[PDB]
Amino acid sequence: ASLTEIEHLVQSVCKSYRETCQLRLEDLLRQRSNIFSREEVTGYQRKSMWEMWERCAHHLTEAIQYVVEFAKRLSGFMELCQNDQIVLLKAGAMEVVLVRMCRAYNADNRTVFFEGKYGGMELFRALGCSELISSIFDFSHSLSALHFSEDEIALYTALVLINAHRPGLQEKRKVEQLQYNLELAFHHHLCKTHRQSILAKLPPKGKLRSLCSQHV
Numbered sequence: 001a002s003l004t005e006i007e008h009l010v011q012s013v014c015k016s017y018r019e020t021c022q023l024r025l026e027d028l029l030r031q032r033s034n035i036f037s038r039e040e041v042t043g044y045q046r047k048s049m050w051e052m053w054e055r056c057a058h059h060l061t062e063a064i065q066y067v068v069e070f071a072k073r074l075s076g077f078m079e080l081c082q083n084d085q086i087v088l089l090k091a092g093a094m095e096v097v098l099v100r101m102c103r104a105y106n107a108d109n110r111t112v113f114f115e116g117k118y119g120g121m122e123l124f125r126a127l128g129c130s131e132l133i134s135s136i137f138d139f140s141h142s143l144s145a146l147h148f149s150e151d152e153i154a155l156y157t158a159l160v161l162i163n164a165h166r167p168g169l170q171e172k173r174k175v176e177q178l179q180y181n182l183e184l185a186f187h188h189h190l191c192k193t194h195r196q197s198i199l200a201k202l203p204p205k206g207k208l209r210s211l212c213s214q215h216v
C-alpha cells in the first residue's frame, strides 16, 4: 500500500461511516434547540425501569446494528475469518457506540439526544443507575471538547474495531495488517487536515474498554 492508496482507504472508511451513522450530524445539531419540557421529563421519570430498559435496549441494539454495517463496509473486514469478525465486533461494537454518542451530546446544556429531543441525565432516573449514566455523560462531555470531525470519528472508530490485541483471534497477523494501514490512514489524514493535535487527547484504549466491561 502506497500513499495514494492510503487516501482511497481513508475516503472509503469515511464513506462507510457516512452511510452507517444512523443519525446525520446536521440533524443532531439542528435538534439541539428542541429540548424535553419539565412535564415530559417527569413523564419519562414516572416510567418503570423495565419500560426505560426496553426503550434504551431497543435504541442501542439498533445502534449496534449500524456499527456492524459499518464494519461490514470496511475494506478487508469481510476478508477476515468468521471467528475473528465476531471477536472484533463482540469486543468493539459497544465501544464504537459510546464514541459515536458524543455527536448526540450537547456540552452547552449537558444533554443528549433520545427519542426526538434532547434531555439531561435526569431523564433516565427510572433506570436506577446514575453511576453508569453520569460516566457516559462525562465521557461524552470530554470527547465534545475535541470537536471531532465526522471523518475523525470514522477513522478512530474503525481503529476501535480493528484491534489485534483482542483475545480470541485466530488470525492475529491478518488483523494487524488492517490495523497498521488504518493507523497510517488516520495519521495521514490528521496531517492533511492539520489536526495532529488530537492524537495526544484521544482517550486511552484501555479506558474505552474498561467503561464497557463495567457497562456489563
Ligand SMILES: COc1ccc2c(n1)CCN(C(=O)[C@H]1C[C@@H](CC(=O)O)C1)[C@H]2C(=O)Nc1cc(F)c2c(c1)C=CC2(C)C
Residues within 6 Å of the ligand: 022, 023, 056, 057, 059, 060, 063, 097, 098, 100, 101, 102, 104, 112, 113, 114, 115, 116, 124, 133, 136
Ligand atoms: C450512539 O449514538 C447514538 C446517540 C443517541 C442515540 C443513538 N445513537 C441511537 C438512536 N437514539 C434514539 O433516541 C433513536 C432515534 C430513534 C427515532 C427517533 O425518535 O428519532 C430513537 C439515541 C439514543 O438511543 N439515545 C440514548 C440512549 C441510551 F440508552 C442512553 C442515552 C441516550 C444516554 C444514556 C443511555 C441510557 C446510555
